[PDB]
C-alpha cells in the first residue's frame, strides 16, 4: 500500500503508506496523493530516505549509522522537517 508525494518541481515520489504516515502533517493531508508547493525534489527525496532510515533503525539492536545531510540542502531540509513535524 503506497501513497504519492509530489514535489514543487513536479517529481512524484511513491512511498509506502505507513512510511508517509510517520509525518503527522502528511497523515492530515491524506485524511492518496499529496502536493508540496514549497518542497523541491532535492529535499523531498531526502525526506523519503529518512522515512526508510527511521523505519529500518527504530528500536534496532544493530548499530545505527549517521543520517547524512549535505550542507547545501540542510537549511531547506530543516524547514521541510519542521513543517512535516519529524
Amino acid at each position: 500500500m503506497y501513497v504519492k508525494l509530489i514535489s514543487s518541481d513536479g517529481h512524484e515520489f511513491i512511498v509506502k503508506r505507513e512510511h508517509a504516515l510517520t509525518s503527522g502533517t502528511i497523515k492530515a493531508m491524506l485524511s492518496n496523493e499529496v502536493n508540496f508547493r514549497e518542497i523541491p525534489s532535492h529535499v523531498l527525496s531526502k525526506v523519503c530516505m529518512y522515512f526508510t532510515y527511521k523505519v529500518r533503525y527504530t528500536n534496532s539492536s544493530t548499530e545505527i549509522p549517521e543520517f547524512p545531510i549535505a550542507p547545501e540542502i540542510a537549511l531547506e531540509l530543516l524547514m521541510a522537517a519542521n513543517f512535516l513535524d519529524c
Partner: protein
Amino acid sequence: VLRSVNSREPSQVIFCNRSPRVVLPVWLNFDGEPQPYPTLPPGTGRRIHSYRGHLWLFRDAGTHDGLLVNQTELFVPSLNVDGQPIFANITLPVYTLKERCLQVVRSLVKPENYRRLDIVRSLYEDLEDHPNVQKDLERLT
C-alpha cells in the same frame, strides 16, 4: 534528585563507543552535579572502574548531542557476575529529521549568525536552544 548513590561497591564497566561521535562520559556526582570524564574516540572502548548505583550519561563531546547507552539515556553500573564487567554500549539515537537538521546547521553556522538565517523565529530559537545537560537532567527528573 538524580544523583549517584555513594555505595563504595566497585563495578567494572566497558564504555564501548559504537557511534561515529567523540563521546563525553558524564558521571552524576553525589550532589547531582555532572562531572565530565575523559572522552572516547569513535569505535573505541575503555575498561573503567565505577561503582554500583552510580549514574552516567553520554554526550557528543563537541556539540553535547544526546547519545544512548544500552538503548536508554542513563546507565547505572550493576553487580559484576562471575567477575565479568558490565558492558555499556554507546550508540547514536535515531534522531528526528528536525533534530538532525539542526545539528548540521549548528555545525555550519556560528551562533552569532543563527539570526541572519532566512527562517522563522522559532527555528532560530530551536538552533539557539543547544543540546544542554542541565535541561535534560531537569527533564529526566
